[PDB]
Amino acid sequence: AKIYKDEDISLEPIKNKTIAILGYGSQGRAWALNLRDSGLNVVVGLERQGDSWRRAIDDGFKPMYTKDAVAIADIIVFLVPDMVQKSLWLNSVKDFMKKGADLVFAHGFNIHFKIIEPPKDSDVYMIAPKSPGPIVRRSYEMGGGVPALVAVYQNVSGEALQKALAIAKGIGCARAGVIESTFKEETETDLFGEQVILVGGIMELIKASFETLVEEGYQPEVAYFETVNELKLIVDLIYEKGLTGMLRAVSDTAKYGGITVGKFIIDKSVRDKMKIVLERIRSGEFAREWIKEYERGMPTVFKELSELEGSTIETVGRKLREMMFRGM
Amino acid sequence: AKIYKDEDISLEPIKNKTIAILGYGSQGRAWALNLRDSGLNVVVGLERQGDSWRRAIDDGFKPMYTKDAVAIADIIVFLVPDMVQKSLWLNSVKDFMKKGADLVFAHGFNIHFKIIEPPKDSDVYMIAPKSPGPIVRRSYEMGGGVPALVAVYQNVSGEALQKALAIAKGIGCARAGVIESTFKEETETDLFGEQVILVGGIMELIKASFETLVEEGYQPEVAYFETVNELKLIVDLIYEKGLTGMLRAVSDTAKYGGITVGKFIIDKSVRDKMKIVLERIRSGEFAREWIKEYERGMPTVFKELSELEGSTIETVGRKLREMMFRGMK
Numbered sequence: 001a002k003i004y005k006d007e008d009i010s011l012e013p014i015k016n017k018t019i020a021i022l023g024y025g026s027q028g029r030a031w032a033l034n035l036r037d038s039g040l041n042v043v044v045g046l047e048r049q050g051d052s053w054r055r056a057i058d059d060g061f062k063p064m065y066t067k068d069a070v071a072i073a074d075i076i077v078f079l080v081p082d083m084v085q086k087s088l089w090l091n092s093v094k095d096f097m098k099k100g101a102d103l104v105f106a107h108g109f110n111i112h113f114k115i116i117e118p119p120k121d122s123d124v125y126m127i128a129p130k131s132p133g134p135i136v137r138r139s140y141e142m143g144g145g146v147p148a149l150v151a152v153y154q155n156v157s158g159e160a161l162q163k164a165l166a167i168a169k170g171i172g173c174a175r176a177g178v179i180e181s182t183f184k185e186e187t188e189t190d191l192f193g194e195q196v197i198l199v200g201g202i203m204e205l206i207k208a209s210f211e212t213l214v215e216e217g218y219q220p221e222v223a224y225f226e227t228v229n230e231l232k233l234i235v236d237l238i239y240e241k242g243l244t245g246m247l248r249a250v251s252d253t254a255k256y257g258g259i260t261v262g263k264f265i266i267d268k269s270v271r272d273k274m275k276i277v278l279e280r281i282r283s284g285e286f287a288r289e290w291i292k293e294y295e296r297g298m299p300t301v302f303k304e305l306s307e308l309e310g311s312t313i314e315t316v317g318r319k320l321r322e323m324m325f326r327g328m
Numbered sequence: 329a330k331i332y333k334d335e336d337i338s339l340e341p342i343k344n345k346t347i348a349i350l351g352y353g354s355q356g357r358a359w360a361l362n363l364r365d366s367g368l369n370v371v372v373g374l375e376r377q378g379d380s381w382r383r384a385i386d387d388g389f390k391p392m393y394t395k396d397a398v399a400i401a402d403i404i405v406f407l408v409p410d411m412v413q414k415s416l417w418l419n420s421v422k423d424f425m426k427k428g429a430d431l432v433f434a435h436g437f438n439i440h441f442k443i444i445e446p447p448k449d450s451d452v453y454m455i456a457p458k459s460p461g462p463i464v465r466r467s468y469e470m471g472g473g474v475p476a477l478v479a480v481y482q483n484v485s486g487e488a489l490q491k492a493l494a495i496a497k498g499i500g501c502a503r504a505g506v507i508e509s510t511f512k513e514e515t516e517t518d519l520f521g522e523q524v525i526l527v528g529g530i531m532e533l534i535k536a537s538f539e540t541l542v543e544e545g546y547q548p549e550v551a552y553f554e555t556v557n558e559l560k561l562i563v564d565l566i567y568e569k570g571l572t573g574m575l576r577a578v579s580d581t582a583k584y585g586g587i588t589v590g591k592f593i594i595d596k597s598v599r600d601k602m603k604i605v606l607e608r609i610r611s612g613e614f615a616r617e618w619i620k621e622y623e624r625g626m627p628t629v630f631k632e633l634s635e636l637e638g639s640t641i642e643t644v645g646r647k648l649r650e651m652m653f654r655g656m657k
């Protein structure tokens with residue numbers, strides 16, 4: 001597949017266009033900052049004069065209410081939570097946007113699961129960074145970037161994909177590599193990844209590892225160094241040199257232990273569970289369940305955050321990180 | 329427990345000791361380099377004039393054969409593979425070392441599982457960096473370090489712990505933090521962690537994730553960006569801000585997906601397996617199995633390496649890494 005880099009993409013398609021960034025959270029702050037640094041014309045649109053509005057002011061923007069931002073926008077980017085996008089659309093975008101403005105997403109959930117039906121005369125496209133928001137900004141500030149997918153749902157203009165690629169360049173992603181995908185592929189692979197590995201799987205693997213050692217009477221600080229802190233060091237090797245480069249760096253003891261236990265921990269049953277997860281994403285069932293959970297108040301989310309924040313792994317970790325990270 | 333940092337530890341107890349680093353592999357190169365850079369007296373001792381001998385010359389050392397390094401050493405550090413240590417001991421150390429020289433390990437396996445029984449008149453101690461070898465070096469070259477455990481098996485001098493802490497400081501680990509442990513704790517926790525998460529769990533999680541997407545027909549490059557490359561970005565957040573910091577950074581959709589599916593994937597059956605893995609470490613069974621597998625020629629290890637290096641995840645990953653890492657013109 002073509003991997004696009006800076007040299008493959010022009011910013012010209014989105015120059016002299018007003019880009020309204022709707023929201024100023026994890027992705028929103030990063031896009032708005034990186035696009036402004038890249039010399040594009042950004043306005044921040046917000047529903048509330050609260051925390052993110054204050055943050056935008058502190059970063060040197062003059063935020064607008066959504067309705068006012070969209071009225072002047074040539075490109076509108078939905079960087080509020082997925083579960084909020086429908087109501088934002090209906091209340092502050094649909095009737096306020098310029099006719100023919102581009103509608104742009106960072107995840108394909110709302111378009112792919114037919115939550116929002118866009119106007120037929122708007123380009124509709126996506127840039128989905130394969131990264132958490134704060135690292136979309138950090139990478140960019142450090143002169144790098146993160147990979148992204150681009151995708152097009154409607155190409156009225158004849159240059160939707162070029163626009164998508166230009167925004168990806170503007171937020172740094174073409175420093176790393178951008179691949180063309182579809183709204184279906186992106187939504188299904190993004191949901192799957194964060195569910196089974198990037199959030200779900202790694203967090204539960206960490207917590208189960210750490211808690212096994214602490215339950216068995218080992219020093220919790222040892223546990224944290226072994227099952228949390230070292231993970232970053234190992235994953236850095238994978239990131240640079242693959243699983244092969246990581247495995248060559250670790251002891252033969254660890255190679256034998258890992259190769260045999262890994263397959264014991266992550267066995268055919270876990271593989272079957274990944275296929276079930278993927279199925280429930282592809283059928284729309286996950287999206288149905290998420291919508292219902294949000295409409296209940298997201299208690300699963302809030303309950304987990306409160307229990308986690310005060311749990312042993314996090315209190316021992318905060319203490320140790322403060323000690324480790326004092327610096328020179 | 330006390331977490332010792334640079335300001336808590338003196339180098340004085342190992343000044344003017346000759347330190348023989350036996351081996352020059354993943355840990356050995358890092359220890360040798362970092363201790364030399366710290367100003368300590370290091371000699372590299374090797375059985376073979378092969379690859380690590382050439383690497384040590386390239387790095388500015390004048391390696392010695394083991395027997396000759398140990399004969400002038402005050403501190404002897406076993407940084408060859410765990411399964412080689414007994415033969416090294418019997419053939420090139422026991423009968424050649426100075427009487428009373430310190431015997432030092434980076435993992436407690438050989439002492440804890442009674443493979444090597446040291447002389448009664450030597451200090452025996454350990455510095456176990458909680459990091460892969462190349463990062464022990466890299467951290468140090470970047471003015472930082474990695475955490476370590478220290479532990480004492482025999483304190484004949486009265487200053488074994490102080491020496492272990494001094495080495496830990498010499499290799500940079502007291503820039504991060506050093507904690508006192510035991511040969512038993514370190515061996516058991518270390519084996520556990522690399523088995524269930526740092527090597528075994530994460531590599532099989534990654535492969536299973538990636539493979540599921542490729543089997544199901546998605547672009548392998550997408551699968552790599554999603555299930556391999558991004559993990560580093562996420563784990564960086566955990567490393568800095570814990571699980572809470574990570575989870576606050578990702579989308580609400582991802583918080584709900586992860587919280588629910590994570591507990592599906594890593595369920596009670598997996599937690600029970602982790603207790604069983606631990607049990608087999610504590611009972612000796614893992615150590616038994618490892619020894620037997622080594623004596624077969626470590627086929628499990630070599631077969632996996634050969635299969636892995638040629639596998640889709642690795643070939644697709646090498647291609648993409650080379651593209652991602654080219655950098656700005």
Ligand SMILES: NC(=O)C1=CN([C@@H]2O[C@H](COP(=O)(O)OP(=O)(O)OC[C@H]3O[C@@H](n4cnc5c(N)ncnc54)[C@H](OP(=O)(O)O)[C@@H]3O)[C@@H](O)[C@H]2O)C=CC1
Pocket residue numbers: 022023024025026027028046047048049050051052053078079080081082084105106107128129131132133134577578579580581
């Ligand atoms: N987070 C991530 O790293 C990634 C996210 N994505 C996608 O990016 C898009 C945005 O997600 P993300 O950055 O996590 O969003 P956030 O959850 O960080 O969005 C917070 C922003 O939305 C505003 N907002 C929150 N609730 C409402 C409300 N009820 N009504 C009006 N505005 C509100 C907040 O304003 P206030 O300050 O007033 O609360 C703030 O500006 C999603 O499509 C997501 O899937 C893509 C890649 C990764």
Ligand SMILES: NC(=O)C1=CN([C@@H]2O[C@H](COP(=O)(O)OP(=O)(O)OC[C@H]3O[C@@H](n4cnc5c(N)ncnc54)[C@H](OP(=O)(O)O)[C@@H]3O)[C@@H](O)[C@H]2O)C=CC1
Pocket residue numbers: 249250251252253351352353354355356374375376377378379380381406407408409410412416433434435456457459460461462
């Ligand atoms: N790897 C890691 O990151 C970690 C390792 N440890 C511990 O550190 C210790 C050392 O491990 P590690 O660094 O992985 O070792 P390596 O596997 O990297 O050791 C390679 C070194 O040992 C020499 N060697 C290999 N085979 C033999 C042989 N049959 N006879 C003589 N010398 C030989 C090699 O010489 P040549 O070039 O001639 O082959 C080379 O100098 C172990 O106790 C381990 O558990 C602790 C923390 C993490």
Ligand SMILES: CC(C)NC(=O)C(=O)O
Pocket residue numbers: 131132133190194198199562577578579580581582
């Ligand atoms: C792992 C996480 C940053 N990825 C996402 O796609 C998200 O937050 O939705």
Ligand SMILES: CC(C)NC(=O)C(=O)O
Pocket residue numbers: 234249250251252253254459460461518522526527
């Ligand atoms: C994960 C790995 C670097 N840790 C070890 O302790 C080892 O290699 O034995």
Ligand SMILES: [Mg+2]
Pocket residue numbers: 129130131190194
């Ligand atoms: Mg994602």
Ligand SMILES: [Mg+2]
Pocket residue numbers: 107190191194579581582
């Ligand atoms: Mg997502």
Ligand SMILES: [Mg+2]
Pocket residue numbers: 457458459518522
């Ligand atoms: Mg270890």
Ligand SMILES: [Mg+2]
Pocket residue numbers: 251253254435518519522
């Ligand atoms: Mg180990």
